[PDB]
Amino acid sequence: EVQLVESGGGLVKAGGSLILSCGVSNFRISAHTMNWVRRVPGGGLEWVASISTSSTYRDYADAVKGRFTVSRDDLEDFVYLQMHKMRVEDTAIYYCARKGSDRLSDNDPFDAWGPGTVVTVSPASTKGPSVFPLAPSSKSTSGGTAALGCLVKDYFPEPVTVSWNSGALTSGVHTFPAVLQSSGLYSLSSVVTVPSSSLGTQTYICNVNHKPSNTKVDKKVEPK
Amino acid sequence: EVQLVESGGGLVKAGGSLILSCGVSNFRISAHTMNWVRRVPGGGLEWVASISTSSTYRDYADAVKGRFTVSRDDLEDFVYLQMHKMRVEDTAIYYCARKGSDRLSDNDPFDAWGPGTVVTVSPASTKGPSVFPLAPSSTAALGCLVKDYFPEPVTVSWNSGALTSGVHTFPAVLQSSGLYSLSSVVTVPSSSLGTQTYICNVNHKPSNTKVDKKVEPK
Amino acid sequence: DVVMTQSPSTLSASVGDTITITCRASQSIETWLAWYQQKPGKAPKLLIYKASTLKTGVPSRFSGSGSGTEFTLTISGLQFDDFATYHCQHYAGYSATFGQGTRVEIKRTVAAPSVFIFPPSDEQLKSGTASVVCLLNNFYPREAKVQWKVDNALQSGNSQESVTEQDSKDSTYSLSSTLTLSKADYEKHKVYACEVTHQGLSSPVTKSFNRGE
Amino acid sequence: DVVMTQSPSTLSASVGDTITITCRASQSIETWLAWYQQKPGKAPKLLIYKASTLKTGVPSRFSGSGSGTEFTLTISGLQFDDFATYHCQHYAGYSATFGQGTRVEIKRTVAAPSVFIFPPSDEQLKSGTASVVCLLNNFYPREAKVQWKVDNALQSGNSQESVTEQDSKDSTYSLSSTLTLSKADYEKHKVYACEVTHQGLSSPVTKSFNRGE
């Protein structure tokens, strides 16, 4: 029996990109116009894109023109759908469907469909960080050499900039590269070493700026 | 002047699939063999795949052969990389690289590179569910919430299959965390609260996880 | 630049009935019209093309007619396998456009939902997340509205719902809605409420609980 | 299956030095060899191809030689911009293979890390997640090992590390390791410690704290 199978669905952030693929069984795509169709949560179908044989023409729905691209690989029997600058209303089950009939003509219906792949676009394109204090150790050495900092956790996308005391404290500062957590949010820590003797006198505030979400946080770090 | 740009990276769970693409600026790909290369966390480069002009050749590194596919689109100037059955060691920065030189020959180096897209494969291919009780209100309804599992499916019975009447197990929903969640409920006589014991049996074959949760009044 | 409109959006009937679905085009499309069947979570299946040609293997109880701007799909003797969504489609050489879909369901008497609200379990709350669940049990027809109110404040965007298929014994539907909130946000307010409307209710029904009671 | 071997894995030198990086092929590859530069987080840049041909625009202080199985990249007068990783590559018509890369760094005296441990903040701990941070400050060379132990139990898979580039003033590196645990798991144990080993330390250094002081 003829078969199609989509791959590549998942969760996407608004504005992000996701690429789908489609493979087939028991026929060659080269003789067929191939199509992408999506079923929106309300239940209706929306034609998305088509690509003619030999890629002579690529036609797109108005709602996706300029954002989506369809490609075909007739030699290994794949169709692709690039989706860029994605919007919440692109959320749907996406199906890969061949145009065809018992005898191929200039205009046939969609006689074969894949089972569909779920694509979900979340509305938030950004998220501001949580800022937690990295408190200096109460058991420091008497005379100097203490460490303090800020943990900048769960933000998206990069980058964040950090200063200390509005830029007055620069010596001894290390702001580390962010790491991508299993949640898909970034997290970095910024630390500075200072004399233990200044604890209590110097006030230490880390200034976290996250331009994508236009979020700024000033957190005061203190002992215990 | 020449530029390449990868799209499609992100986080994937082991065993999952992810598709990358590569676009270009200020040249046409049609004359070029196009390549994928990855930078593993240790710092070294690994050639992944190549696709010649006219798609005559597709070659793959032994470690990805049978799981990856490379395709080219000469009319809108894109290259694709399908990555299937992904493994922890596929974690890397993926670059799209052009084979070429000022004067093209049969064997040129990689003279132009995209900036790279990060691809991260998490070690867990599955996760067993958390099971929380939906307690009846002090014709009563009770149930179980089967939260934070991956992938589908989970099966649920009640009292090892002896209680079937009035049971509804809902389709799972995909949460924004990438984990699935569903609830299973049953309606019973309000009079049986206290006398009949109600246990939901959650079975999650992918993670080979079983949970029996007792649901009681309060 | 062709718009297709199907009628009706929901068609309710009994087994054995003969039913008709209408599809209208905003301009003439000759006989370039196809009809598809689709079951929930399944692929569409081609039924008819060129307005009236049955695809090989499709049962003879399916038929189509029309031309120009007015087309019809007829199902002569509904069987249980035929309850599904049906789509009409104008297909051209390179592009296509679909109607909005018609859902065909089993007709039964109106039944109001039995409504239940569940607070988060203490266990879940300790992990830092609060899922509040609202249940609408055994109602008909499928159209219902659920709204969340927290301390009488209408929520938006922080809930998900799912609906069962029509029950095999009583042909009703059931629906679950989950409102998700962080531990911090959940403990900021007291009254949590689910407000329900449904054709079987003469006025909306609200179920609520007070946090910690 | 061509295997490429670079030597050394790490090369430490001063500005102005003349340095050589060697690449050995497991079998003859004639002169089908290229050299790339790569800076952290950036794309590779082609330096040399056909073993010894300088790509247009590449500074003349780069040169390459060799054939068969033994190849060398020479940088004659290291400049600050040249500290980076360098990769050799055998390239064939439809395939390629790389060496493991050579990281070229600024040489300085050995410097042991100053180690600091930070417990999770009370604020963060109440949300249900515990981040414990260990800091290795201003050490050289780059190779360091961090192990987390909770109640003397070696942790695995629940930590991430990050390392800075060589400091512009003192040519040292710094490293941060974050151990992440749920509120539940964090309150299951008492002693939290990070153990650090490094060439500048005659024995491993351990910093610890008791939950709650």
Swiss-Prot record, chain B:
Localization (cell): Secreted; Cell membrane
Domain named Ig-like: residues: 129-216
Transmembrane intervals: none
SS bonds (residue pairs): 144-200
Free-text function comment from the UniProt entry: Immunoglobulins, also known as antibodies, are membrane-bound or secreted glycoproteins produced by B lymphocytes. In the recognition phase of humoral immunity, the membrane-bound immunoglobulins serve as receptors which, upon binding of a specific antigen, trigger the clonal expansion and differentiation of B lymphocytes into immunoglobulins-secreting plasma cells. Secreted immunoglobulins mediate the effector phase of humoral immunity, which results in the elimination of bound antigens.
Subunit structure: Immunoglobulins are composed of two identical heavy chains and two identical light chains; disulfide-linked.
Protein name: Immunoglobulin gamma-1 heavy chain
Species, as recorded: Homo sapiens
Lineage: Eukaryota, Metazoa, Chordata, Craniata, Vertebrata
Parent-protein residues present: 120 to 220 of 449
Curated annotation (Swiss-Prot), chains C, D:
Function: Immunoglobulins, also known as antibodies, are membrane-bound or secreted glycoproteins produced by B lymphocytes. In the recognition phase of humoral immunity, the membrane-bound immunoglobulins serve as receptors which, upon binding of a specific antigen, trigger the clonal expansion and differentiation of B lymphocytes into immunoglobulins-secreting plasma cells. Secreted immunoglobulins mediate the effector phase of humoral immunity, which results in the elimination of bound antigens.
Species whose genome carries this gene: Homo sapiens
GO biological process assignments: adaptive immune response
Disulfide pairings: 134-194
Part of the whole protein covered: 109 to 213 of 214
Region (Constant (C) domain): 109-213
Compartment annotation: Secreted; Cell membrane
Listed name of the protein: Immunoglobulin kappa light chain
Subunit structure of this chain's protein: Immunoglobulins are composed of two identical heavy chains and two identical light chains; disulfide-linked.
